[PDB]
């Protein structure tokens, strides 16, 4: 029960909830069975329409009517959003040429610009060059406001996910909603868009801008309408908030359109069905623009016009179904669509193996519309592995495409031509942001964003201190004509060793052998300076990177390259090189096959041993300065030293010497020359973030050498190719994967064939922001560029998709 008979008069659309069982008159309480008797009556009404008419100008008000077009009309602050227009000859906002506004113009009572977060569901990034004929008001605040051509959402580009990232800056993997259906074992509980249990709490983590604003002392509007609530009536309500007194008065306003998402999936992307929805947003943006204009606003509020996700063509017929490749299809219980997450559909049979089910999964069908992955074994990109409520088998299914469990499911469980959740790089997902205001720069492009980014952002712009996220705080600064971020490098916590000769060979008993005794006055002076550092500013040219936490470790100097050598791992953190143009490739000289030498800077307990990988069959190693890139055949013993080595599962030695063999030497002929850092990364609990030393769960059999789960590399150069990699002016422009380290390369249903056909294939799928791999290793890159920091911060946020314009 809820004694709900109180009255609304008064308290229409009020912004505290009142204790039960009393009645509301917000937003939530025609979702709680809360509201007032005559909520309805008084707070949703509706006659007379929402336009002003030449013939209702100075009306006598009846305040039965939805808005009003009277002389005390703009003192009461609820004029229909036209009574400008038509009854004092005033121009609408789109009509008016757009003039830079240059500082905030803002009425008494107003101590800061306010924020309006006017959101669109599955608005198509695509949408604003095509449907640009029928949009004159948002094409205004593009090219008058701050605009990408695209922004990215997070994986899965769902709703639900998308908005409460855009929210919190988190990665749903962080903020709990990782679909817009759920099961936590936990809770024993499902999650779903209809129903009852997505209202408590607990599915809900982090902290969102609303919450962030009110523990600071900011009021803010709602963030949640009634589907029933029409728009038009959501318009005049944040209209009304606007005219509040000043004590009262909310600084940040959120508007939700349902639209286009809603048609998207009736009618397909660009289904002639879909200028209408088109032509419905502008015109709620011209509404709200008016509006502004009216009470003196629009040269003084921010908006924010932004996007969930986009939308792809997607038909029926377009299913793969799993009872088509497993027998046992009542074991598993799957949540379907555009993206697959499988469980065991009963806890008690413990016979069930992810095992079985993965190979049955995999590669079966020439034409598979979908992958199979172990959770932890999806690109890295995506951080989508680390909650309790996503299943340990996933399935990242074809654009275009969906999967289900059996043929039932599809026609009792055709009516649909769109729809979304696909992988977050895939152009038809990708979505849009606009920036209008005094606080965004003005006629400004700037390059794509992913959306985790602009919590941050409308922190600053709200004068809160953003509480911890995923963004990079100061990566968007230059969206923002004045801010108040001043972004700094964090500091090095280790400095690093820089051990000199210190052993005699004969102190080391490791099992390796090499063909190195057969070899001056002039040459010893001149590779004396490379052990030194004499070339450290052709191999290291931004720096050495900075280690965030506490470890022993020592640089260590050669002619072709320059490491950041671990003690405690047994082999390097990071290793660099710079590959010129000019540049050759050469081969291993067939005495020099199993070549591995001690190295004389570095002690037999602090260094790996072959005797290791001999005993160890599953395990061979490899080199991160690749010895086909040698300078010189006397350089090349330097790429065999025991602490340029890594443990390499002979599956993942193919993939890695056709990189540092073919891969290389390309890039560096494309770009003017490559910077390159590779290193090792230890994840095995799949957080995204380094693991210490005591939780390491792999060793080579018998050693102490750990097994990194993954392997980096960051490959730099001069955005202005026309300059060399190690001689470039000004701005950079970099491209980083994160490979998985697998035993087997199950995951490229083609590797069978000759490298070339898949490995490029591979990696272009394990693309990498550098900001990935500094939450992975705890080190800090770029230290020492010409560069500002902000767009330090910018290139490291960046992520080289390998997509075609959009
Ligand atoms: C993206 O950004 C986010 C945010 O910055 C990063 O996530 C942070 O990472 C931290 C490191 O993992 C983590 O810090 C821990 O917090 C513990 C307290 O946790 C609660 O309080 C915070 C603060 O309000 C709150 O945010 C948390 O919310 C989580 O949990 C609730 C309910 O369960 C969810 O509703 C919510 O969605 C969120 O879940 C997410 O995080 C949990 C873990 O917290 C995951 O399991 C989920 O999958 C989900 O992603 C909590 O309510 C604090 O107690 C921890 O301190 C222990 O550990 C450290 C390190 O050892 C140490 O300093 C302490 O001594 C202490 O040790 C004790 O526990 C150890 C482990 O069992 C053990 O070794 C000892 O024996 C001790 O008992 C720890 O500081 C922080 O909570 C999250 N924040 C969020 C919001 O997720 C994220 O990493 C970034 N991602 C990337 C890729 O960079
Ligand atoms: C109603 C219930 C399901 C109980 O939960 C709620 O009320 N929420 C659940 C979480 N949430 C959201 O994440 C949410 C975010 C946005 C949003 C959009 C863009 C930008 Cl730049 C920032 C934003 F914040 C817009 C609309 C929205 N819609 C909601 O519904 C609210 C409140
Ligand atoms: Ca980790
Ligand atoms: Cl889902
Ligand atoms: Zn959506
Ligand atoms: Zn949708």
């Given at each position: 029960?809820?004694?709900?008979?109180?009255?609304?008069?008064?308290?229409?659309?009020?912004?505290?909830?009142?204790?039960?069982?009393?009645?509301?008159?917000?937003?939530?309480?025609?979702?709680?069975?809360?509201?007032?008797?005559?909520?309805?009556?008084?707070?949703?009404?509706?006659?007379?329409?929402?336009?002003?008419?030449?013939?209702?100008?100075?009306?006598?008000?009846?305040?039965?009517?939805?808005?009003?077009?009277?002389?005390?009309?703009?003192?009461?602050?609820?004029?229909?959003?036209?009574?400008?227009?038509?009854?004092?000859?005033?121009?609408?906002?789109?009509?008016?040429?757009?003039?830079?506004?240059?500082?905030?113009?803002?009425?008494?009572?107003?101590?800061?610009?306010?924020?309006?977060?006017?959101?669109?569901?599955?608005?198509?990034?695509?949408?604003?060059?095509?449907g640009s004929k029928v949009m004159p008001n948002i094409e205004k605040l593009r090219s008058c406001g701050t605009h990408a051509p695209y922004m990215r959402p997070?994986?899965?580009?769902?709703?639900?996910?998308?908005?409460?990232?855009?929210?919190?800056?988190?990665?749903?993997?962080?903020?709990?909603?990782?679909?817009?259906?759920?099961?936590?074992?936990?809770?024993?509980?499902?999650?779903?868009?209809?129903?009852?249990?997505?209202?408590?709490?607990?599915?809900?983590?982090?902290?969102?801008?609303?919450?962030?604003?009110?523990?600071?002392?900011?009021?803010?509007?709602?963030?949640?309408?009634?589907?029933?609530?029409?728009?038009?009536?959501?318009?005049?309500?944040?209209?009304?908030?606007?005219?509040?007194?000043?004590?009262?008065?909310?600084?940040?306003?959120?508007?939700?359109?349902?639209?286009?998402?809603?048609?998207?999936?009736?009618?397909?992307?660009?289904?002639?069905?879909?200028?209408?929805?088109?032509?419905?947003?502008?015109?709620?943006?011209?509404?709200?623009?008016?509006?502004?204009?009216?009470?003196?606003?629009?040269?003084?509020?921010?908006?924010?016009?932004?996007?969930?996700?986009?939308?792809?063509?997607?038909?029926?017929?377009?299913?793969?179904?799993?009872?088509?490749?497993?027998?046992?299809?009542?074991?598993?219980?799957?949540?379907?669509?555009?993206?697959?997450?499988?469980?065991?559909?009963?806890?008690?049979?413990?016979?069930?193996?992810?095992?079985?089910?993965?190979?049955?999964?995999?590669?079966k069908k020439p034409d598979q519309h979908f992958k199979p992955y172990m959770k932890q074994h999806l690109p890295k990109r995506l951080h989508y592995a680390n909650?309790?409520?996503?299943?340990?088998?996933?399935?990242?299914?074809?654009?275009?495409?969906?999967?289900?469990?059996?043929?039932?499911?599809?026609?009792?469980?055709?009516?649909?031509?769109?729809?979304?959740?696909?992988?977050?790089?895939?152009?038809?997902?990708?979505?849009?942001?606009?920036?209008?205001?005094?606080?965004?720069?003005?006629?400004?492009?700037?390059?794509?964003?992913?959306?985790?980014?602009?919590?941050?952002?409308?922190?600053?712009?709200?004068?809160?201190?953003?509480?911890?996220?995923?963004?990079?705080?100061?990566?968007?600064?230059?969206?923002?004509?004045?801010?108040?971020?001043?972004?700094?490098?964090?500091?090095?916590?280790?400095?690093?060793?820089?051990?000199?000769?210190?052993?005699?060979?004969?102190?080391?008993?490791?099992?390796?052998?090499?063909?190195?005794?057969?070899?001056?006055?002039?040459?010893?002076?001149?590779?004396?300076?490379?052990?030194?550092?004499?070339?450290?500013?052709?191999?290291?040219?931004?720096?050495?990177?900075?280690?965030?936490?506490?470890?022993?470790?020592?640089?260590?100097?050669?002619?072709?390259?320059?490491?950041?050598?671990?003690?405690?791992?047994?082999?390097?953190?990071?290793?660099?090189?710079?590959?010129?143009?000019?540049?050759?490739?050469?081969?291993?000289?067939?005495?020099?096959?199993?070549?591995?030498?001690?190295?004389?800077?570095?002690?037999?307990?602090?260094?790996?041993?072959?005797?290791?990988?001999?005993?160890?069959?599953?395990?061979?190693?490899?080199?991160?300065?690749?010895?086909?890139?040698?300078?010189?055949?006397?350089?090349?013993?330097?790429?065999?030293?025991?602490?340029?080595?890594?443990?390499?599962?002979?599956?993942?030695?193919?993939?890695?010497?056709?990189?540092?063999?073919?891969?290389?030497?390309?890039?560096?002929?494309?770009?003017?020359?490559?910077?390159?850092?590779?290193?090792?990364?230890?994840?095995?609990?799949?957080?995204?973030?380094?693991?210490?030393?005591?939780?390491?769960?792999?060793?080579?059999?018998?050693?102490?050498?750990?097994?990194?789960?993954?392997?980096?590399?960051?490959?730099?150069?001069?955005?202005?190719?026309?300059?060399?990699?190690?001689?470039?002016?000004?701005?950079?422009?970099?491209?980083?994967?994160?490979?998985?380290?697998?035993?087997?390369?199950?995951?490229?249903?083609?590797?069978?064939?000759?490298?070339?056909?898949?490995?490029?294939?591979?990696?272009?799928?394990?693309?990498?922001?550098?900001?990935?791999?500094?939450?992975?290793?705890?080190?800090?890159?770029?230290?020492?560029?010409?560069?500002?920091?902000?767009?330090?911060?910018?290139?490291?946020?960046?992520?080289?998709?390998?997509?075609?314009?959009?």
């Amino acid at each position: 029960w809820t004694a709900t008979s109180g009255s609304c008069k008064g308290r229409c659309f009020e912004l505290q909830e009142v204790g039960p069982p009393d009645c509301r008159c917000d937003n939530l309480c025609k979702s709680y069975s809360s509201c007032c008797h005559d909520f309805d009556e008084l707070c949703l009404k509706t006659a007379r329409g929402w336009e002003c008419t030449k013939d209702r100008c100075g009306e006598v008000r009846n305040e039965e009517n939805a808005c009003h077009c009277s002389e005390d009309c703009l003192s009461r602050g609820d004029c229909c959003t036209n009574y400008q227009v038509v009854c004092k000859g005033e121009s609408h906002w789109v009509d008016d040429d757009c003039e830079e506004i240059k500082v905030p113009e803002c009425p008494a009572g107003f101590v800061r610009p306010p924020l309006i977060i006017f959101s669109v569901d599955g608005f198509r990034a695509s949408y604003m060059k095509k449907g640009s004929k029928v949009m004159p008001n948002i094409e205004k605040l593009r090219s008058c406001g701050t605009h990408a051509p695209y922004m990215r959402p997070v994986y899965p580009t769902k709703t639900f996910p998308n908005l409460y990232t855009l929210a919190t800056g988190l990665y749903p993997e962080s903020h709990g909603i990782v679909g817009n259906s759920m099961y936590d074992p936990v809770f024993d509980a499902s999650f779903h868009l209809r129903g009852r249990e997505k209202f408590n709490h607990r599915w809900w983590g982090g902290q969102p801008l609303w919450i962030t604003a009110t523990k600071q002392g900011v009021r803010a509007g709602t963030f949640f309408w009634s589907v029933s609530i029409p728009h038009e009536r959501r318009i005049l309500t944040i209209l009304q908030w606007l005219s509040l007194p000043d004590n009262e008065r909310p600084s940040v306003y959120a508007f939700y359109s349902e639209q286009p998402d809603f048609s998207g999936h009736k009618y397909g992307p660009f289904g002639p069905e879909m200028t209408n929805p088109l032509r419905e947003i502008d015109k709620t943006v011209g509404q709200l623009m008016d509006g502004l204009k009216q009470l003196r606003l629009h040269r003084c509020v921010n908006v924010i016009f932004v996007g969930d996700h986009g939308m792809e063509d997607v038909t029926c017929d377009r299913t793969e179904f799993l009872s088509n490749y497993l027998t046992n299809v009542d074991d598993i219980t799957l949540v379907p669509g555009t993206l697959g997450r499988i469980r065991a559909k009963s806890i008690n049979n413990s016979k069930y193996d992810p095992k079985t089910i993965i190979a049955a999964l995999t590669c079966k069908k020439p034409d598979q519309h979908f992958k199979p992955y172990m959770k932890q074994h999806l690109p890295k990109r995506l951080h989508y592995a680390n909650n309790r409520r996503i299943e340990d088998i996933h399935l990242l299914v074809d654009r275009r495409w969906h999967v289900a469990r059996k043929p039932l499911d599809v026609y009792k469980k055709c009516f649909f031509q769109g729809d979304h959740g696909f992988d977050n790089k895939v152009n038809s997902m990708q979505t849009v942001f606009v920036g209008y205001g005094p606080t965004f720069k003005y006629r400004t492009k700037v390059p794509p964003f992913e959306n985790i980014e602009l919590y941050n952002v409308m922190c600053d712009l709200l004068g809160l201190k953003p509480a911890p996220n995923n963004g990079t705080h100061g990566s968007l600064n230059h969206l923002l004509r004045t801010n108040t971020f001043r972004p700094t490098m964090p500091d090095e916590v280790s400095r690093p060793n820089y051990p000199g000769i210190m052993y005699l060979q004969s102190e080391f008993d490791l099992g390796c052998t090499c063909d190195d005794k057969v070899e001056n006055k002039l040459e010893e002076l001149n590779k004396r300076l490379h052990t030194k550092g004499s070339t450290k500013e052709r191999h290291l040219l931004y720096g050495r990177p900075a280690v965030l936490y506490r470890t022993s470790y020592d640089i260590l100097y050669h002619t072709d390259f320059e490491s950041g050598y671990s003690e405690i791992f047994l082999m390097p953190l990071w290793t660099s090189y710079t590959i010129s143009k000019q540049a050759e490739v050469s081969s291993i000289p067939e005495h020099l096959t199993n070549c591995v030498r001690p190295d004389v800077r570095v002690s037999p307990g602090f260094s790996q041993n072959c005797l290791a990988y001999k005993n160890d069959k599953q395990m061979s190693y490899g080199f991160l300065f690749p010895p086909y890139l040698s300078s010189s055949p006397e350089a090349k013993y330097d790429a065999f030293l025991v602490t340029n080595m890594v443990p390499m599962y002979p599956a993942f030695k193919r993939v890695w010497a056709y990189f540092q063999r073919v891969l290389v030497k390309k890039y560096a002929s494309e770009r003017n020359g490559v910077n390159v850092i590779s290193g090792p990364i230890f994840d095995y609990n799949y957080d995204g973030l380094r693991d210490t030393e005591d939780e390491i769960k792999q060793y080579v059999e018998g050693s102490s050498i750990p097994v990194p789960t993954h392997y980096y590399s960051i490959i730099t150069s001069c955005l202005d190719f026309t300059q060399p990699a190690d001689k470039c002016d000004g701005p950079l422009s970099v491209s980083s994967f994160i490979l998985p380290h697998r035993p087997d390369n199950d995951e490229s249903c083609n590797s069978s064939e000759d490298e070339s056909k898949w490995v490029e294939e591979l990696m272009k799928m394990h693309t990498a922001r550098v900001r990935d791999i500094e939450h992975l290793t705890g080190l800090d890159f770029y230290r020492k560029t010409s560069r500002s920091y902000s767009e330090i911060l910018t290139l490291k946020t960046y992520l080289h998709t390998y997509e075609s314009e959009i």
